[PDB]
Chains A and B, each alone.
Chain A
């Protein structure tokens, strides 16, 4: 229940950090 919401929150944070790194490492 709440644990799944916390896990999805962690997944979104990790994905956004990944995308931010990729954005500058791409050019």
Chain B
């Protein structure tokens, strides 16, 4: 039943091709990236942190968050395969389980029901048997919703600052003074004082 070596390396290279899709749709990369983009938009600085810096930060945060899942895959699936204890098929099947559990932990039952009803799947007893083709889109949708929730919540203190400065300027009669120019330095000061970067990364990690 064990695949021949040439078939094994063909599978390995073809799977390595799909790496960005796995990173985006199976890990926590997408939510962190969306929150970072929304935060950058929220400070009034559309291009202050370069895209590469934020992408690297999101990659490192994703690696740290997914370290337990990778450790489980190594210990349970990859290590026996590397010692020739188990074949590639059963190794992949065993490695699917920890990632599947992690994705189920961070999905919403309503989206799972939507994709199950849409795919005309029969009744499924418990979370033990849910196909990956059903779980992946539901997990992606749940990640999108959670990222938007976090971004909308983050948008609040800067809105408070903008409103208070606009009101202060308006009550002085300064009718033609735009509030963005005065608000941007104070947005930067607010984000600096609360130790914003490390606090936001810690909050993103804690939510996973």
The answer to whether A and B touch directly, with their CB atoms under 8 angstroms apart, is no
Q: Which residues of A contact B (CB under 8 A)?
A: none
Q: Which residues of B contact A (CB under 8 A)?
A: none
